[PDB]
Amino acid sequence: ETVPVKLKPGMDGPKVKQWPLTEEKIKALVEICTEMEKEGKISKIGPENPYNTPVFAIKTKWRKLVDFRELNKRTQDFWEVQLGIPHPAGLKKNKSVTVLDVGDAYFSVPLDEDFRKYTAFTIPSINNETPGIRYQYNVLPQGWKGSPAIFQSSMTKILEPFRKQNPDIVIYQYMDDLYVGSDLEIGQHRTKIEELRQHLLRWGLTGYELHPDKWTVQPIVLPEKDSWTVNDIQKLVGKLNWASQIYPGIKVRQLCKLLRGTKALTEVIPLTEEAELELAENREILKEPVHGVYYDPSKDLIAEIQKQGQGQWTYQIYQEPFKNLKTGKYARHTNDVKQLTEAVQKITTESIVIWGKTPKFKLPIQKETWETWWTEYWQATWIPEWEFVNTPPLVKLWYQ
Amino acid sequence: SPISPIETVPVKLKPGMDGPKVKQWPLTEEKIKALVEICTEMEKEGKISKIGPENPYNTPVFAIKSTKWRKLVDFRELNKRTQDFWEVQLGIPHPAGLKKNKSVTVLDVGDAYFSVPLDEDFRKYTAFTIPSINNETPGIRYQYNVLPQGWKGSPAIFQSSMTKILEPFRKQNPDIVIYQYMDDLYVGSDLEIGQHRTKIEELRQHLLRWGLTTPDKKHQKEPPFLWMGYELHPDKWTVQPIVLPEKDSWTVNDIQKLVGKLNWASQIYPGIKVRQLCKLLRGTKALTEVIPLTEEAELELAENREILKEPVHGVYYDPSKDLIAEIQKQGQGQWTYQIYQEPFKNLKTGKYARMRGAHTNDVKQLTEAVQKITTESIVIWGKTPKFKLPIQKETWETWWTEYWQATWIPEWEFVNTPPLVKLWYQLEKEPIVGAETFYVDGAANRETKLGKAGYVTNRGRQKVVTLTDTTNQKTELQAIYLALQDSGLEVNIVTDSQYALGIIQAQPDQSESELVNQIIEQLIKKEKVYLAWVPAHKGIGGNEQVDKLVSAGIR
Ligand SMILES: Cc1ccnc2c1NC(=O)c1cccnc1N2C1CC1
Ligand SMILES: CCOC(=O)C1C(=O)N(O)c2ncccc2C1O
Ligand SMILES: [Mn+2]
Numbered sequence: 023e024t025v026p027v028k029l030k031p032g033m034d035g036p037k038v039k040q041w042p043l044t045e046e047k048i049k050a051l052v053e054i055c056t057e058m059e060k061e062g063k064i065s066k067i068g069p070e071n072p073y074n075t076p077v078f079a080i081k082t083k084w085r086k087l088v089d090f091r092e093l094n095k096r097t098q099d100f101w102e103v104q105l106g107i108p109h110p111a112g113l114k115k116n117k118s119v120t121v122l123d124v125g126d127a128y129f130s131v132p133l134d135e136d137f138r139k140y141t142a143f144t145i146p147s148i149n150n151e152t153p154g155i156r157y158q159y160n161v162l163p164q165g166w167k168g169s170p171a172i173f174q175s176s177m178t179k180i181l182e183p184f185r186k187q188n189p190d191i192v193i194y195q196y197m198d199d200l201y202v203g204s205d206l207e208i209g210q211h212r213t214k215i216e217e218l219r220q221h222l223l224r225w226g227l228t229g230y231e232l233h234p235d236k237w238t239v240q241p242i243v244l245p246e247k248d249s250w251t252v253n254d255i256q257k258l259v260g261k262l263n264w265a266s267q268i269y270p271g272i273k274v275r276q277l278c279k280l281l282r283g284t285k286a287l288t289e290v291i292p293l294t295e296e297a298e299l300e301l302a303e304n305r306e307i308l309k310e311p312v313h314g315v316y317y318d319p320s321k322d323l324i325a326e327i328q329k330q331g332q333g334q335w336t337y338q339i340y341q342e343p344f345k346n347l348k349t350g351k352y353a354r355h356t357n358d359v360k361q362l363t364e365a366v367q368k369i370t371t372e373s374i375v376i377w378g379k380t381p382k383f384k385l386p387i388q389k390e391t392w393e394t395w396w397t398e399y400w401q402a403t404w405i406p407e408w409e410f411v412n413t414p415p416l417v418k419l420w421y422q
Numbered sequence: 423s424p425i426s427p428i429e430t431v432p433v434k435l436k437p438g439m440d441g442p443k444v445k446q447w448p449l450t451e452e453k454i455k456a457l458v459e460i461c462t463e464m465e466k467e468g469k470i471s472k473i474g475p476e477n478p479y480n481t482p483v484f485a486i487k488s489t490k491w492r493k494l495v496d497f498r499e500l501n502k503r504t505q506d507f508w509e510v511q512l513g514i515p516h517p518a519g520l521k522k523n524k525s526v527t528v529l530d531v532g533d534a535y536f537s538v539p540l541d542e543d544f545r546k547y548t549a550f551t552i553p554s555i556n557n558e559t560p561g562i563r564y565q566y567n568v569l570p571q572g573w574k575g576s577p578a579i580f581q582s583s584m585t586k587i588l589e590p591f592r593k594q595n596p597d598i599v600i601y602q603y604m605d606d607l608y609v610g611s612d613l614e615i616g617q618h619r620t621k622i623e624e625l626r627q628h629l630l631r632w633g634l635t636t637p638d639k640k641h642q643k644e645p646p647f648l649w650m651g652y653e654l655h656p657d658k659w660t661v662q663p664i665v666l667p668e669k670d671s672w673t674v675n676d677i678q679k680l681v682g683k684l685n686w687a688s689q690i691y692p693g694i695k696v697r698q699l700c701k702l703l704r705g706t707k708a709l710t711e712v713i714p715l716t717e718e719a720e721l722e723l724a725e726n727r728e729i730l731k732e733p734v735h736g737v738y739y740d741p742s743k744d745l746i747a748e749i750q751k752q753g754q755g756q757w758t759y760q761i762y763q764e765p766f767k768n769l770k771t772g773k774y775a776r777m778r779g780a781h782t783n784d785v786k787q788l789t790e791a792v793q794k795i796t797t798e799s800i801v802i803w804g805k806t807p808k809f810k811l812p813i814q815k816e817t818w819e820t821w822w823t824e825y826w827q828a829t830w831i832p833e834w835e836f837v838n839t840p841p842l843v844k845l846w847y848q849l850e851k852e853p854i855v856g857a858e859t860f861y862v863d864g865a866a867n868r869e870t871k872l873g874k875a876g877y878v879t880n881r882g883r884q885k886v887v888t889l890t891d892t893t894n895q896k897t898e899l900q901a902i903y904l905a906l907q908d909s910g911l912e913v914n915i916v917t918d919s920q921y922a923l924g925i926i927q928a929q930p931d932q933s934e935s936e937l938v939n940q941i942i943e944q945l946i947k948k949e950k951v952y953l954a955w956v957p958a959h960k961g962i963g964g965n966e967q968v969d970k971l972v973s974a975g976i977r
């Protein structure tokens with residue numbers, strides 16, 4: 023039943039252009055929307071509604087994903103400092119975390135009359151042959167951050183008995199997703215999930231499986247080799263020099279003492295002993311977390327992704343540059359964009375699990391390319407913020 | 423002129439703001455007379471209705487000239503106060519995306535805006551006053567009951583109404599294609615010149631039933647239709663007549679008009695070029711200044727004249743066939759393309775010539791042109807075409823894997839149409855044994871703008887040039903350039919500039935910097951080049967040497 027919602031003072035509703043869609047996605051959306059309209063979830067709108075929010079189709083059954091990133095910014099105060107959902111620090115420590123699409127719940131709750139206009143979206147036509155089909159939500163929409171904030175009290179009710187029966191089970195609600203984490207054995211965990219799906223089923227809802235305890239760091243591995251060449255030791259110091267800007271205690275001097283005077287690169291030079299003394303003591307520091315780096319909940323998260331080739335991708339999460347909260351990797355018909363879109367999702371889930379927000383991504387890709395292709399492989403119910411960037415050619419090898 | 427039985431569209435004003443109250447300027451007697459004749463005529467038709475000065479709102483009126491007048495209302499202030507509306511379209515169709523049809527008919531709506539009603543609660547804000555001969559009498563005051571000319575919301579609402587009117591007819595005539603454009607309708611089908619003529623009249627009835635008058639059999643336009651700069655036959659399309667005047671003198675304005683025409687023509691005429699004509703407009707002068715034609719511009723104009731020799735048309739789209747896009751390098755920075763379904767019968771042509779960033783190569787340019795065409799195809803056809811590219815799978819394969827950016831060209835095939843796209847040099851993965859290891863560095867004094875570029879080698883060699891108006895970045899590129907100049911066909915170059923490494927590592931073959939082009943010129947002449955990076959100021963053999971050598975008197 024409609025709880026009053028409004029915008030943040032000063033700012034107005036979203037006016038975002040709709041992306042060109044392919045024939046099949048448009049057809050899929052026309053079907054999806056004809057239905058939702060019969061069931062009263064959405065209603066056709068007139069030109070008196072100047073607002074707009076992009077819509078896409080994703081995945082066997084096609085399904086509708088609405089890009090509410092813009093609306094979420096303009097209602098932030100509502101879903102964050104009015105009806106904010108608290109984040110539990112235990113979720114990341116769990117042995118197993120299952121993610122459930124609980125987003126079908128929101129259609130039972132009607133949306134505030136005066137707010138419905140801001141949820142306007144459009145299904146465009148091929149070659150702009152017909153005017154776009156315009157709609158607005160009558161109920162809480164999927165992908166809008168206000169939805170779980172409003173539903174929070176209904177959710178607490180639904181989960182009350184299950185929470186009572188399993189005090190050691192962590193349940194976190196982010197968006198359309200419920201994050202359920204336990205320290206149980208896997209068979210017992212997967213059973214407790216099915217057990218939970220039955221609770222949900224009695225209210226009208228309907229898995230994907232993570233292991234956050236097994237997220238050990240990506241230590242910047244320094245090479246071990248027999249008979250180093252001048253070139254190799256230069257690459258070695260460059261890696262260390264950079265590592266000392268983040269990790270305290272990284273010593274470098276002894277290595278360069280071996281590089282004195284203008285020498286050739288291929289000239290093999292013998293290694294002393296002070297090298298292995300510093301090297302191993304460095305390796306020791308890299309395999310531990312960063313000392314002095316802590317998450318400020320009022321600062322945006324940022325993630326950088328570097329292409330490594332051979333279907334490999336390294337990434338780093340931070341708020342202040344070089345002050346890494348977490349580094350990582352990603353293993354591999356499979357193309358760059360497919361892998362990149364898959365990596366982004368992986369990194370984003372981990373971020374939600376750890377901090378309860380999505381990071382702004384710095385993407386090693388051309389804007390247009392990403393925009394045309396990302397939906398082909400996108401599977402999540404949310405969309406993180408993204409920028410497009412030039413990966414510094416040396417950041418690449420450092421994390422390699 | 424019918425006033426349509428439609429539902430009304432609820433219009434409001436921009437929050438906080440009240441309606442317009444702009445004073446009516448007094449007009450001349452012939453102007454005041456003319457307005458009364460017009461307004462009472464509109465009054466009897468239901469277009470406008472009388473009110474009194476209890477209604478506090480006003481918008482000024484005017485009358486312009488022919489032996490009779492037209493009434494102009496300046497809705498500027500109301501327009502500034504009326505709410506924002508949804509856009510009247512997100513884009514305009516390209517003819518190339520239209521299905522082929524046996525027959526196509528134009529029906530323009532009689533008296534567009536005045537046929538559709540205006541929301542009751544907004545009518546009061548459209549108040550205008552026809553004043554008396556001077557100060558004199560209180561004026562005659564009217565308000566609109568229909569959508570007014572030049573009002574912010576009339577475009578969107580009329581279009582909104584038309585969509586709603588057609589909706590039932592569309593859904594009970596699924597194999598009938600109708601397109602709304604302003605006060606026009608384009609209707610096509612595949613039925614014969616008999617029952618097609620029938621079907622128009624069924625539509626005209628449906629329109630008159632909803633208070634919209636459309637011309638009959640005898641008064642409707644004939645193919646081809648002029649529309650938005652196109653000619654549109656039922657089975658073919660082309661751009662409207664392009665005529666490049668032969669002038670003794672070419673002014674900026676003339677060249678601008680030429681470029682615009684050529685750009686327009688290029689939708690269907692293959693091989694159109696405009697780089698040399700465009701070059702002239704750079705850092706320009708007055709509209710009327712005569713620009714003497716460059717030889718290359720003269721060559722470009724002649725080529726374009728030649729291409730536009732005889733008329734060329736485009737075909738319409740067939741949904742059952744795939745699309746084929748072919749791309750060709752036309753010269754420097756210039757890329758040309760064709761899209762067809764059946765070998766060489768073009769749906770449309772086009773050109774790409776952008777400069778994404780300072781430094782680029784043909785493989786980067788080619789793949790950017792691919793993305794441009796890819797987007798376009800989605801818009802026009804709702805699918806991506808099969809690509810045919812002047813590049814070897816292996817040339818492409820190599821570039822992608824090694825490159826730091828993520829890329830994805832959809833399904834494509836090599837086509838041997840020179841110039842072929844290739845990389846012009848490649849940096850080594852391994853330092854060259856028995857080759858002279860140059861250590862390069864630059865230095866620049868920020869206030870003076872003076873700089874030193876230089877190298878020390880493993881073989882004792884040592885050079886230092888002075889540069890006068892420079893930046894650190896330029897000095898490093900200069901230093902790397904020196905190392906290439908005096909090294910011969912096999913060199914290791916270690917630098918401390920990531921900027922420099924970055925540019926070179928991505929195999930550019932053209933730049934917006936002359937210095938970078940000199941480096942390219944050198945890199946091709948080479949046989950084996952290895953470039954590597956070391957951090958600045960970490961006691962590295964040759965690096966500390968050149969640094970001290972270039973920092974002499976500079977920092
Ligand atoms: C201007 C325009 C834009 C969009 N579609 C069309 C038209 N008009 C045509 O002349 C036309 C011709 C060929 C095929 N479809 C066309 N039509 C379709 C509607 C019958
Ligand atoms: C800002 C000056 O800092 C330095 O000492 C540096 C310097 O001398 N050189 O040559 C340099 N060369 C390339 C990159 C960065 C630097 C430096 O920071
Ligand atoms: Mn330097």
Ligand SMILES: [Mn+2]
Pocket residue numbers: 863864865958969
């Ligand atoms: Mn230096």
